[PDB]
């Protein structure tokens, strides 16, 4: 049968649904866009930018090699870019 | 059924089949011991894992002296 | 007589909201130059 | 009629998405595992653990993105956010491979949650719990490949990474190093998976071409009512057909449907066992008799010896880049190579 | 001896095919 | 070929033991009816 | 080659030259064959789960079905009622014909693509 | 002392015989190569 | 830093615009629920 | 009739024959123990615990007897190499014999309980029906388990009244059975501290006694009794299997990673000792020490005990085996005879070179010689035409210090390459391959075989847990669902709460 | 209730996916991941 | 004695207690409000 | 001792086959 919730087919064809969501859906899309365009996503997650995978004259991977010093190792690599 | 001497001695130990304490009984107290045991297995696990590091606890073969 | 906010409501927006956020982030990514 | 029974009432209400007590474990863990995978593949690198790009943000596409495993130097660290490695730093956590264990562990408890859900719903609805039992095979596969296999090796690094191409590399690794195609436990898994897919297709086809004419239209789907007592296709005619085409046929509908449970579930369980062996490098790598002859007799060649040459190529050519923590330097002159190529 | 063993098993499987087809329990209706 | 000498008895018992088991069960089923 | 290791040789050579793992038609084949095994197990477990009690604990439930009986041997609404709640209602078949056609189509189409 | 009431007849039909014999013979066919090694 | 409000602002205004448009009908739901 | 997979259900309501079956199982397991030990005694070579220890010889139960203090034979030898000892009755042979006598006695008791199944003890005095008060039985048995566990720790392991257990130094050089005192501090949870094993059994033993007393006197709550079907013996099988596979996963991990209870002199090294160069560091540490105090290279390396060198060799790495490579490790690389010495390689310019060691992942590995900085200076080339680094071009020589080839140098390129192919395995040994007709291919140790079997059984018992658990909670529908289940109960909306008919709308 | 015809909603959601997916494929040839 | 990792242990132990306790507080509240009719 | 390797299989089958014969006949006698 049915469990009482409002049917989706009724909702997505309703004017009130689209009044609210024609704002929320582009807003979320724009928010996501800005997360990348500002560069905040790089900083939050630690992802290298195209210019910061290697130092200029370098071809060694900054590979983490120690378990408990690993946090400091990554920071040592990043400083070899500034 | 056959009665035996040892049977008659053990008799009261197999005599309360079905007897229950009412309601929830000791269930809250059991829950407390389960919580303590989980925390305690967590510590034991994370010591072995080297995620919990403790003073004077060297998780290595070199703890045989 | 329909409720608006339900468990169903929460399940949907729990997936739908970050999905569109992620789609916007991924669309922006197509314009990044090396 | 205390709080526990009131809560039980609410968890078990018939709603669009059933919750249940199992929901408390299933829904956070499933959501987090799913969320971690989508987060990592969109934004998170594998540069520091693998020297690989692995996110949309870095230029990867759907086939090459992965949540990759942590660096071999993490051993089997749980890599808790608040643990000694990342020390509560979210950014370092991501760069050190913490999302991998996050997804693996939360995934494991979600699988428990889901199987408990199959138990819970089956008890409330009143059916036998065979669907939960069948799901034991996915669980065995997940734990043996994602948890038991790397636990036997040096670190999580050698577990599969959560990605399409990364799983492809996992396949090729098992060929070159474990000679996994030669493992009779995998072969039983193959026979179970291909056996299931065959059973699946042959059972659906048979029913659809032994249907009774119960309506008048060229669409035979409308002529079925889910409350009818009558079977909707002729088992008798189906049995004659297959008896005369193939020699033998099903005659018992219960056995048939049990067999469909049995075949792929068993197959998966078998491959899990072989993977447990591979955790220890307990490979079915060689046949000793073949090697003794081949060493002494340079004209003796089989498809067995031909495939090991291929394995030796795979190992030497992918090892330096696939295990970067080992600093393998293979000069050109040591690389195994046939003529010209 | 291993060749004999492999062919022996295979031949047993073919004989079993013969019996499973021609000497099956016949399916009877209702 | 220099095969493991116990592979023969391994294989023979591997076939014989469970097959005999099934045959025992089948025949005593038939003499019931 | 018509042999077990010969088959594996074919596969390894094929991957080196065609990168078949990265080909969409192989990926659909794996989906046809993984999904086939999945839906085999699902369908077998749902029908087995909803067998109507016809036998005692001391006998195989298989003897609850007699070859050529007219009545179905399981409760498809109970199966639908379980599976519709395991996921949600409209992600479940209650039409046996649509279901079995689905069972036929998925691995057949997937294996067409991999061929 | 009475005979044991818990005893039961055991059965294996002909089809299960054929299934089991097939299982054992193919399993032997698969593992024998590995036993000989 | 500054980029965080920039990212959060469309979400916040999306949440506000939904709150204002739905608030009357959400009131009846909480009420009918004694 | 019953299907073949259900013949043993005739015991579910027959406690006497259930006991008969359990006795027969126990008779069989004990008989196996006695048979396995006799076979191992008849095949064990006790003459060299240094280069032919028990774990190279495919010994499986011998190390478990040795672990708890049985170390000698009535034949006069001990596994520690001591000779002329008198073990008393508790020799390997006496332990084997006791298990066989125990087996015979369990067998006879099983016959008795099978015939006299209808004991009044098994009947419920109120209903005249067979019934087992499983809650109280749990408490009795748990109390017993705690007595035994405590005594095991308080008397056997401490040496208070018993032998102690096997302990060793960190490099497995000087192990033996010693009494062990409890470690009550936090290092008692260190898996590598033997005192923790003692403290565990004492403290857990006391908790077991207290919990046992609780479960004998305190009845289960009605809620729990109903939830877990505590009147159904199959619920116990369900939870027992769960605990059993839990224990099986733990023993597999500690065998594989190593702990105070899996010492390397009884089971062999672990793979991680190869991965981390654990013995190679210690060896280097001693050679540096000998050198700093002025010993010559020959003297520093000759002081290296062969036993330590034998650990620094991949043939003893448990992760170098194969599933169907059967038998003792000796059947593969051979019976080790002597350490040949430490190979030092040098190029024509006198630089010392280092063979890159084989990682456990690789069935085969190329021969690559590096300098102390990691720069490649020599190899054995595959394609010869553009070879830059051949032994012939680079003038590589091999010199041996300590061992059987001590003070010998080799310069002919085929000989030098031959040792370089062995140097990828770690230290170089002389093997007897004739005696066992060894085929030359690495096999795993008892540590590997034990870990494999128990990891596999654990996973399989998880399915037993799921199956018997499902059977307990769904007993009412085992034979099929209700033929009068009406569609309103399984269709949506009819009931507020799923399955609860009292919540109709 | 049904003020917006459902086929309209399906058509407009339709190209919405076509645009986003097509954007992702253009991006395979431009910028990051294009090999250029 | 009280090491960084032991502090992180309590950090994680407390955080999980918050999550479970908060979750259950919320679930018990909703279950009290929206009861079934019998 | 340098014994015949086929000795083991000959002895094993020598016991196994006729014994199985008799067991089969005895069990089906009992169930009728
Ligand atoms: C089915 C139902 C599903 C249920 C879902 C469950 C979901 C959650 C599961 C929990 C996950 C547990 C993983 C624990 C991590 C682990 O093990 O972590 C491993 C650590 C041991 O650490 C490892 O130890 C190794 C050996 O170390 C030793 O050796 C070195 C060199 O010799 C040095 O001496 C070193 O100091 C010394 O410690 C290396 O150091 C590795 O780098 C290091 O990771 O053990 C430990 O934490 C604990 C080890 C003992 C407990 C065993 C746990 C059982 C599971 C293991 C089963 C796999 C068995 C192997 C089979 C193959
Ligand atoms: C059912 C839900 C569930 C489950 C099973 C898990 C399970 C897990 N999570 Mg996840 N998590 C969840 C929900 C869940 N999570 C939610 C909702 C979030 C979002 C907030 C997260 C966010 C999250 C992160 C960010 C991380 C995890 C991690 C983990 C793992 C380690 C957890 C741990 O050490 O707990 C330890 C804590 C407990 C077991 C709680 C014990 C509570 C007991 C019962 C009471 C103790 C008393 C208390 C301490 C007294 C307080 C004292 C006070 C008065 C001073 C584990 C697999 C980690 C991981 O995956 O690492 C790779 C990790 O980094 N989780
Ligand atoms: C004829 C070709 C063929 C076939 C049919 C198989 C069949 C199989 N292989 Mg083999 N394989 C082959 C060739 C083949 N193989 C070759 C040539 C190689 C090269 C050596 C391999 C290498 C290989 C490896 C390395 C492994 C296998 C494994 C397996 C098994 C996978 C079981 C499974 O479904 O895991 C699928 C995964 C699961 C069932 C785990 C649980 C999954 C959960 C339930 C998913 C839930 C998802 C959730 C809903 C959210 C998803 C969202 C997201 C999709 C967006 C199966 C028996 C695996 C195995 O044996 O493990 C036991 C394994 O590790 N194979
Ligand atoms: C009179 C009693 C007795 C004694 C003194 C021994 C002594 C010995 N046996 Mg024998 N054995 C016995 C009875 C006995 N056995 C019986 C009755 C059987 C048949 C079941 C066997 C079967 C057997 C086998 C199969 C083997 C031995 C072996 C051995 C040796 C090693 C023991 C060992 O490692 O234990 C190992 C210790 C354990 C398994 C303990 C684990 C128990 C779990 C952890 C308890 C679970 C917890 C509990 C239920 C609840 C928690 C309580 C808590 C609150 C306190 C040793 C010489 C080994 C050997 O070398 O044989 C040659 C071997 O392989 N024995
Ligand atoms: C926990 C169990 C266990 C473990 C770990 C060991 C370990 C060991 N034993 Mg012992 N042994 C055991 C039990 C065990 N044994 C038992 C029960 C017996 C009596 C039969 C023996 C009799 C015994 C002898 C007589 C000898 C050993 C020897 C050895 C060593 C080599 C073993 C080897 O090569 O295996 C190789 C193992 C395999 C190839 C097993 C493969 C598994 C098969 C393929 C299972 C079949 C699959 C199945 C059908 C799946 C299909 C199901 C599906 C269709 C439904 C090693 C130390 C040897 C030694 O060196 O002694 C000094 C030796 O000569 N053992
Ligand atoms: C302490 C452990 C234990 C115990 C006491 C039982 C007891 C039982 N099981 Mg359970 N079970 C267990 C573990 C256990 N099981 C595990 C680990 C699994 C997963 C494999 C199962 C899976 C399982 C299924 C699927 C079923 C049972 C069933 C049953 C019942 C009938 C069994 C029968 O007649 O077998 C008869 C079996 C034979 C005559 C021959 C089997 C031979 C196998 C293939 C190999 C032989 C093994 C070898 C001889 C020795 C064992 C080695 C190793 C385990 C030590 C009985 C109550 C049945 C049931 O519920 O009926 C109501 C049933 O259908 N069990
Ligand atoms: C840092 C920590 C981060 C993680 C912490 C997570 C905390 C736990 C949060 C758990 C919240 C999930 C419960 C969802 C309930 C809800 O949203 O409103 C559901 C109720 C709404 O109203 C009612 O809905 C009902 C139907 S139903 O129950 O929703 O199915 C209906 O009966 C009624 O008439 C109607 O008014
Ligand atoms: C190819 C594979 C799919 C097979 C095809 C389906 C066959 C079965 C369909 C039969 C019904 C046919 C009648 C048409 C109707 C139809 O087929 O169904 C569409 C259905 C429409 O239902 P409404 O009540 O909105 O509409 C009333 C209509 O059904 C009247 O025609 O909407 C949904 O179910 C989709 C919403 C899911 C959106 C997300 C929900 C929340 C996600 C939950 C998170 C996961 C759950 C947790 C799991 C752990
Ligand atoms: C991790 C983490 C976390 C979490 C997070 C989350 C939870 C997330 C989520 C997220 C998500 C939730 C996301 C989503 C997204 C999505 C997406 C991205 C999608 C996409 C899709 C698409 C692209 C599709 C399309 C298509 C195609 C292509 C074809 C066919 C059709 C279709 C339509 C299907 C936290 C905070 C706790 C903390 C820790 C860390
Ligand atoms: C009567 C008597 C007696 C005698 C006794 C005896 C003489 C004993 C014996 C016993 C024994 C002598 C026993 C043994 C047993 C054995 C067993 C029980 C075994 C088992 C096995 C198995 C089970 C195996 C399995 C398997 C296989 C085969 C393959 C691989 C895998 C597995 C492991 C699974 C006396 C004088 C003392 C006293 C008086 C009385
Ligand atoms: C099952 C109970 C556990 C589930 C929740 C546990 C995790 C909850 C989130 C915990 C993350 C907050 C702490 C992470 C930051 C710690 C910072 C620090 O190291 O000081
Ligand atoms: C009560 C006081 C606790 C100490 C008792 C045991 C003393 C020895 C402890 C230890 O091993 O360091
Ligand atoms: C599908 C819709 C078209 C996708 C964009 C295709 C154009 C890619 C080639 C290019 O950018 O030059
Ligand atoms: Fe069907």
Rg (alpha carbons) of chain D, rounded to whole number: 26
| CA I32 – ligand 7 centroid, Å | 16
In contact, J110 and J28? CB cutoff 8 Å: no
Q: Exposed, middle or buried: residue A20 (CB in 10 Å: 0-12, 13-18, 19+)? A: middle
CA distance G102 to G108: 10
Distance of CA D259 to the CA centre of its chain: 21
Task: Tell whether I19 is within 8 A of chain A (Cβ).
Answer: no
CA distance F2 to D291: 10
**Element of type H or E holding J345:** strand J335-346
Closest residue in L to J500 (Cα–Cα): L38
CA distance J13 to J220: 22
- Does the beta-carbon distance from I10 to A30 stay under 8 Å? yes
Nearest to residue F16, comparing CAs of J25, E12, E23? E12
The dihedral region occupied by D263, where left means phi > 0, alpha psi between -120 and 50, and beta the remainder, is: alpha
Exposure string for D245-279, b = 16+ CB within 10 A, e = fewer: eeeebbbbbbbbbbbbbbbbbbbbbbbbbbbbbbb
Placement of tokens 């939360």 in the chain: D106
CA angle in degrees (0–180, nearest 5) for K20-K23-K29: 155
| CA J57 – ligand 5 centroid, Å | 14
> Whats the size of chain A, residue-wise?
82
In contact, D317 and D179? CB cutoff 8 Å: no
Task: Tell whether F11 is within 8 A of chain E (Cβ).
Answer: yes
**Quick one: how many helices (H) and strands (E) in chain M?**
1, 0
Which of H20, H21, H26, H31 has most ligand 5 atoms within 8 Å of CB, for mutation?
Answer: H31
Q: Which atom of ligand 5 is nearest to the CA of J452?
A: 5
Bridge partners, J481 (sequence order): G52
Exposure string for L12-23, b = 16+ CB within 10 A, e = fewer: beeeeeeeeeee
In chain M, how long is the greatest CA-to-CA distance?
49
D186 in a labelled binding site = yes
In contact, D175 and D314? CB cutoff 8 Å: yes
Output the six-digit token pair for J497. Answer: 């709460």
Q: How far is J483 from chain L (nearest CA, A)?
A: 26
Placement of tokens 């032998």 in the chain: J163
CA distance C25 to A29: 7
Nearest to residue F20, comparing CAs of H13, M22, J21? M22
Method: X-ray
Output the six-digit token pair for D264. Answer: 């792929």
Strands J368-370 and J352-355: antiparallel
**Ligand 7 lined by C2 (C-beta under 6 Å):** no
Q: How far is B29 from chain J (nearest CA, A)?
A: 12
Rounded to 10°, the helix D303-322/D164-178 angle is 130
CA distance G104 to G40: 10
Q: Which of B52, B56, B58 to mutate to test the interface with L (most CBs of L within 10 A)?
A: B52
Q: How many CB atoms lie within 10 A of CB J281?
A: 11
- Does the beta-carbon distance from D45 to A48 stay under 8 Å? yes
Q: Which atom of ligand 10 is nearest to the CA of J107?
A: 1
**Ligand 5 lined by J43 (C-beta under 6 Å):** yes
**Element of type H or E holding J287:** helix J278-292
What would the DSSP string read from start to end of J347-397? -TT--EEEEPPPPTT-SS---EEE-TTS-EEEE--SS-TT-SS-HHHHT-E
In contact, J216 and J140? CB cutoff 8 Å: yes
What would the DSSP string read from start to end of K4-35? S-HHHHHHHHHHHHHHHHHHHHHHHHSSTTS-
In contact, D107 and D31? CB cutoff 8 Å: no
**Element of type H or E holding J95:** helix J92-115
A21 in a labelled binding site = yes
**Ligand 4 lined by J68 (C-beta under 6 Å):** yes
Distance of CA L28 to the CA centre of its chain: 12
Q: How far is J480 from chain G (nearest CA, A)?
A: 4
Q: Which of A4, A29, A50 sits opposite C24 (nearest CB)?
A: A29
Task: Provide CB contacts within 8 A for J167, sequence distance 6+.
Answer: B64, J175, J176, J177, J178, J180, J194, J260, J263
Task: Provide CB contacts within 8 A for I24, sequence distance 6+.
Answer: none
In contact, L11 and D88? CB cutoff 8 Å: yes
Which of D147, D151, D280 has most ligand 1 atoms within 8 Å of CB, for mutation?
Answer: D151
Q: Compute the count of residue pairs across chains E and H with CB atoms less than 8 Å apart.
A: 30
Give the CA distances from residue H17 to residues D157, D230, H23, J29, in Å, rounded to whole numbers and listed in that order: 47, 32, 10, 31
To the nearest 10°, report the CA torsion of J157, J158, J164, J169. Answer: 100
Rounded to 10°, the helix D98-125/D20-43 angle is 150
Q: J53-57 long-range CB contacts below 8 Å, 24 or more apart? A: J53/J265, J53/J268, J54/J79, J54/J266, J55/J265, J55/J266, J55/J267, J55/J268, J55/J329, J55/J445, J55/J446, J55/J447, J56/J268, J56/J316, J56/J328, J56/J329, J56/J330, J56/J335, J56/J336, J56/J445, J57/J328, J57/J329, J57/J330
Domain CATH number, residue G109: 1.20.85.10
* Domain-located, residue G86: yes
Placement of tokens 């309103």 in the chain: J488
Q: How many CB atoms lie within 10 A of CB D229?
A: 8
To the nearest 10°, report the CA torsion of D133, D135, D140, D145. Answer: 180
**Element of type H or E holding J335:** strand J335-346
Distance of CA D121 to the CA centre of its chain: 25
Output the six-digit token pair for D153. Answer: 């090796």
SS3 D211: strand
Give the CA distances from residue D297 to residues A26, D47, D48, D306, G5, in Å, rounded to whole numbers and listed in that order: 73, 47, 48, 15, 20
Task: Provide CB contacts within 8 A for M17, sequence distance 6+.
Answer: none
Q: Which of B39, B42, B54 sits opposite L6 (nearest CB)?
A: B54
Q: Which of A9, A15, A50 sits opposite K3 (nearest CB)?
A: A15
Domain that includes residue K12, residue range: 1-36
Task: Provide CB contacts within 8 A for D82, sequence distance 6+.
Answer: D88, L8, L9, L11, L12, L15
Q: How far is K3 from chain C (nearest CA, A)?
A: 18
**Element of type H or E holding E21:** helix E2-22
CA distance J505 to D108: 38
What would the DSSP string read from start to end of C1-34? ---SS-HHHHHHHHHHHHHHHHHHHHHHHTT---
Exposure string for D122-135, b = 16+ CB within 10 A, e = fewer: bbbbbbbbbbbbbb
Give the CA distances from residue B57 to residues B65, L2, L4, in Å, rounded to whole numbers and listed in that order: 12, 13, 14
To the nearest 10°, report the CA torsion of D231, D235, D241, D244. Answer: 180
CA distance H12 to F19: 13
Give first-to-last CA distance, chain J, whole Å. Answer: 46
CA distance J484 to J493: 19
Chain F residues with CB-CB distance to J1 below 8 A: 29, 32
Domain that includes residue G108, residue range: 24-115
- DSSP H helices in chain A: 8-12, 15-37, 40-45, 70-79
Task: Tell whether D337 is within 8 A of chain J (Cβ).
Answer: yes
| CA F14 – ligand 10 centroid, Å | 18
**Which ligand has an atom closest to residue J188 CA?**
12
Q: Which of L27, L29, L37, L38 to mutate to test the interface with D (most CBs of D within 10 A)?
A: L27
The shares of helix, strand and coil residues in chain M, as percent rounded to the nearest 5, are 80, 0, 20
- DSSP single-letter state for residue J119: B
| CA D99 – ligand 2 centroid, Å | 15
CA distance B45 to J147: 26
* Domain-located, residue G43: yes
| CA J107 – ligand 2 centroid, Å | 51
In chain H, how long is the greatest CA-to-CA distance?
56
Residue nearest to atom 6 of ligand 12 (CA): J184
The total number of structural domains that make up chain K: 1
CA distance J340 to J492: 79
Chain M residues with CB-CB distance to F20 below 8 A: 16, 20, 23-24
CA distance J499 to J503: 9
The total number of structural domains that make up chain D: 1
CA distance C4 to D291: 72
- DSSP single-letter state for residue D68: P
Strands J376-379 and J397-401: unpaired
| CA L7 – ligand 11 centroid, Å | 12
**Element of type H or E holding J134:** helix J134-151
Backbone angles phi, psi at J125, to 5 degrees: -65, -20
CA distance D40 to D69: 11
Nearest to residue B16, comparing CAs of J8, G12, J215? J215
Backbone angles phi, psi at D179, to 5 degrees: 50, 50
Give the CA distances from residue C1 to residues A16, I29, J381, in Å, rounded to whole numbers and listed in that order: 16, 9, 82
Backbone angles phi, psi at J5, to 5 degrees: -80, 10
**Ligand 2 lined by D81 (C-beta under 6 Å):** yes
The shares of helix, strand and coil residues in chain H, as percent rounded to the nearest 5, are 60, 5, 35
Resolution (A): 2.1
Give first-to-last CA distance, chain K, whole Å. Answer: 52
Thinking of the domain J271-448, which architecture would CATH place it in? Roll (3.10)
- DSSP H helices in D143-284: 149-152, 164-178, 184-208, 235-246, 253-279
**Element of type H or E holding J400:** strand J397-401
Bridge partners, J483 (sequence order): none
Give the CA distances from residue J80 to residues D216, J42, J65, J155, in Å, rounded to whole numbers and listed in that order: 89, 18, 13, 23
CA distance A69 to A62: 14
Which of K14, K24, K25, K33 has most ligand 13 atoms within 8 Å of CB, for mutation?
Answer: K25
SS3 L33: helix
Which of J158, J183, J184, J187 has most ligand 12 atoms within 8 Å of CB, for mutation?
Answer: J184
Nearest to residue B64, comparing CAs of J260, J265, J261, J264? J260
What would the DSSP string read from start to end of J53-85? -GGGTT-SSHHHHHHTT--B-TTSBBTTS-BS-
Output the six-digit token pair for B34. Answer: 């389960």
CA angle in degrees (0–180, nearest 5) for J81-J87-J88: 170
Output the six-digit token pair for I21. Answer: 């448009």
Nearest to residue G82, comparing CAs of J476, C6, D14? D14
- Does the beta-carbon distance from J326 to F4 stay under 8 Å? yes
The total number of structural domains that make up chain G: 1
CA distance D45 to D55: 6
- Does the beta-carbon distance from F23 to H13 stay under 8 Å? no
**Domain A8-80 grouped into CATH 1.10.3720.10:** no
């Amino acid at each position: 049968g049915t469990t009482g919730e409002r049917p989706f087919s009724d909702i997505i064809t309703s004017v009130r649904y689209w009044v609210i969501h024609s704002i929320t859906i582009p807003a979320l899309f724009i928010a996501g866009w800005l997360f990348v365009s500002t560069g905040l996503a790089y900083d939050v997650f630690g992802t290298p930018r195209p210019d910061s995978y290697y130092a200029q004259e370098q071809r060694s991977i900054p590979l983490v090699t120690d378990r408990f010093e690993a946090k400091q190792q990554v920071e040592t690599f990043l400083e070899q870019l500034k | 059924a056959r009665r035996t001497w040892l049977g008659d001695i053990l008799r009261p130990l197999n005599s309360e089949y079905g007897k229950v304490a009412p309601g929830w009984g000791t269930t809250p107290l059991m829950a407390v011991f389960m919580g303590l045991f989980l925390v305690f297995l967590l510590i034991i696990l994370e010591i072995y894992n080297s995620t919990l590091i403790l003073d004077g606890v060297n998780v290595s073969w070199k703890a045989l002296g | 007589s329909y409720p608006i906010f339900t468990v169903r409501w929460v399940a949907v927006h729990t997936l739908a909201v970050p999905t569109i956020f992620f789609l916007g982030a991924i669309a922006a990514m197509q314009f990044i130059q090396r | 009629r205390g709080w526990f029974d009131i809560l039980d009432d609410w968890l078990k209400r018939d709603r669009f998405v059933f919750v249940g007590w199992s929901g408390i474990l299933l829904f956070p863990c499933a959501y987090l595992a799913l969320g971690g995978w989508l987060t990592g593949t969109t934004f998170v690198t594998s540069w520091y653990t693998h020297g690989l790009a692995s996110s949309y943000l870095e230029g990867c596409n759907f086939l090459t993105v992965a949540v990759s495993t942590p660096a071999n130097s993490m051993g089997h660290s749980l890599l808790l956010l608040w643990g000694p490695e990342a020390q509560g730093d979210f950014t370092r956590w991501c760069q050190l491979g913490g999302l991998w264990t996050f997804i693996a562990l939360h995934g494991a408890f979600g699988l428990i949650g889901f199987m408990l859900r199959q138990f819970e719903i089956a008890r409330l609805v009143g059916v036998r719990p065979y669907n939960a039992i069948a799901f034991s095979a996915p669980i065995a596969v997940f734990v043996s490949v994602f948890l038991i296999y790397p636990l036997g090796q040096s670190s999580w690094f050698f577990a599969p990474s959560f990605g399409v191409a990364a799983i492809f590399r996992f396949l090729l690794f098992f060929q070159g190093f474990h000679n996994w195609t030669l493992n009779p436990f995998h072969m039983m898994g193959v026979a179970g998976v291909l056996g299931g897919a065959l059973l699946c297709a042959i059972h659906g086809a048979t029913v659809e071409n032994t249907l009774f004419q119960d309506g008048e239209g060229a669409s035979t789907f409308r002529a079925f009512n889910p409350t009818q007592a009558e079977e909707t296709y002729s088992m008798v005619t189906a049995n004659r057909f297959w008896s005369q085409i193939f020699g033998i046929a099903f005659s018992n509908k219960r056995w048939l449907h049990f067999f469909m449970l049995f075949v792929p579930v068993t197959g998966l369980w078998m491959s899990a066992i072989g993977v447990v062996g591979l955790a220890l490098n307990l490979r079915s790598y060689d046949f000793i008799s073949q090697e003794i002859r081949a060493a002494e007799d340079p004209e003796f060649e089989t498809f067995y010896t031909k495939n090991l040459l291929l394995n030796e190529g795979i190992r030497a050519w992918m090892a330096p880049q696939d295990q970067p923590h080992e600093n393998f330097v293979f000069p050109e002159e040591v690389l195994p190579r046939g003529n010209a190529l | 001896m291993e060749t004999i063993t492999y062919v022996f098993i295979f031949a047993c499987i073919i004989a079993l095919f013969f019996f499973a087809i021609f000497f099956r329990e016949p399916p009877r209706i209702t | 070929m220099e095969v493991n000498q116990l592979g023969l008895i391994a294989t023979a018992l591997f076939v014989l033991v469970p097959s005999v088991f099934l045959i025992i069960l089948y025949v005593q089923t038939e003499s019931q009816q | 080659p018509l042999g077990i290791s010969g088959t594996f040789n074919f596969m390894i050579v094929f991957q080196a030259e065609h990168n078949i793992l990265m080909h969409p038609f192989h990926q659909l084949g794996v989906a046809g064959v993984f999904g086939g095994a999945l839906f085999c197990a699902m369908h077998g477990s749902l029908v087995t789960s909803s067998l109507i009690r016809e036998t005692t604990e001391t006998e195989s439930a298989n003897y609850g079905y007699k070859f050529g009986q007219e009545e179905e041997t399981y409760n498809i609404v109970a199966a639908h009622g379980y599976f519709g709640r395991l996921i949600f209602q409209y992600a479940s078949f209650n039409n046996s014909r649509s279901l079995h056609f689905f069972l036929a189509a998925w691995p057949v189409v997937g294996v067409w693509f991999t061929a | 002392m009475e005979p044991n009431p818990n005893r039961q007849p055991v059965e294996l039909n002909r089809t299960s015989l054929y299934l089991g014999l097939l299982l054992i013979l193919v399993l032997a066919l698969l593992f024998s190569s590995y036993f000989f090694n | 830093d500054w980029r965080v409000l920039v990212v959060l602002l469309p979400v916040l205004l999306a949440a506000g615009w939904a709150v204002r448009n739905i608030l009357p009908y959400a009131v009846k739901q909480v009420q009918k629920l004694l | 009739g019953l299907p073949w997979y259900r013949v043993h259900t005739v015991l579910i309501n027959d406690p006497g024959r259930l006991i008969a079956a359990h006795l027969m199982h126990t008779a069989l397991v004990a008989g196996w123990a006695g048979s396995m030990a006799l076979y191992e005694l008849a095949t064990f070579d006790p003459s060299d615990p240094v280069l032919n220890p028990m774990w190279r010889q495919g010994m499986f139960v011998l190390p478990f007897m040795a672990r708890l203090g049985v170390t000698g034979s009535w034949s006069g030898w001990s596994i520690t190499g001591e000779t002329g000892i008198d073990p008393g009755f508790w020799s390997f042979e006496g332990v084997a014999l006791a298990h066989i006598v125990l087996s015979g006695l369990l067998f006879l008791a099983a016959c008795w309980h099978w015939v006299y199944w209808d004991l009044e003890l098994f009947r419920d005095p109120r209903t005249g029906e067979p019934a087992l008060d499983l809650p109280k039985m749990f408490g009795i048995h748990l109390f017993l388990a705690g007595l035994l566990c405590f005594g095991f720790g308080a008397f056997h392991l401490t040496g208070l009244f018993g032998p102690g257990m096997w302990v060793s130094d960190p490099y497995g050089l000087t192990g033996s059975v010693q009494p062990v005192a409890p470690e009550w501090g936090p290092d008692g949870f260190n898996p590598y501290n033997p005192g923790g094993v003692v403290a565990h059994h004492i403290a857990a033993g006391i908790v077991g006694i207290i919990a046992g007393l609780f479960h004998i006197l305190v009845r289960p709550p009605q809620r729990l009794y109903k939830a877990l079907r505590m009147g159904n013996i199959e619920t116990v099988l369900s939870s027992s299997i769960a605990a059993v596979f839990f224990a099986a996963f733990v023993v597999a991990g500690t065998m594989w990673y190593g702990s105070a209870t899996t010492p390397i002199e009884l089971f062999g090294p672990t793979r991680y000792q190869w991965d981390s160069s654990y013995f190679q560091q210690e060896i280097n540490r001693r050679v540096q020490a000998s050198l700093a105090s002025g010993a010559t290279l020959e003297e520093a390396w000759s002081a290296i005990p062969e036993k330590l060198a034998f650990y620094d060799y991949i043939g003893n790495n448990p992760a170098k085996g194969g599933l169907f490579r059967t038998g003792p490790m000796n059947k593969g690389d051979g019976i080790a005879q002597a350490w040949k010495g430490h190979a030092v390689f040098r190029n024509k310019e006198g630089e010392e070179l280092f063979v890159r060691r084989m990682p456990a992942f690789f069935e085969s590995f190329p021969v690559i010689l590096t300098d102390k900085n990691g720069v490649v200076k020599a190899d054995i080339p595959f394609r010869r035409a553009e070879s830059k680094y051949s032994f012939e071009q680079q003038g590589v020589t091999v010199s041996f210090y300590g061992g059987e080839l001590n003070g010998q140098t080799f310069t002919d390129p085929p000989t030098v390459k031959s040792y370089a192919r062995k140097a990828i395995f770690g230290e170089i040994f002389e093997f007897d391959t004739e005696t066992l007709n060894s085929d030359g291919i690495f096999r795993t140790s008892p540590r590997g075989w034990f870990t494999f079997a128990h990891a596999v059984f654990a996973l399989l018992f998880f399915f037993g847990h799921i199956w018997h658990g499902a059977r307990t909670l769904f007993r009412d529908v085992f034979s099929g669902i209700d033929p009068e289940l009406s569609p309103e109960q399984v269709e949506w909306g009819f009931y507020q709460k799923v399955g609860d008919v009292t919540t109709r709308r | 209730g049904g003020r917006i015809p459902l086929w309209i909603v399906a058509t407009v959601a339709g190209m919405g996916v076509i645009v986003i997916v097509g954007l992702f494929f253009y991006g395979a040839y431009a910028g990051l991941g294009s090999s250029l | 004695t009280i090491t960084p990792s032991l502090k992180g242990f309590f950090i994680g132990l407390l955080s999980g207690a918050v999550v479970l306790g908060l979750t259950f507080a919320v679930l018990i509240a909703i279950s009290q409000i929206d009861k079934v009719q019998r």
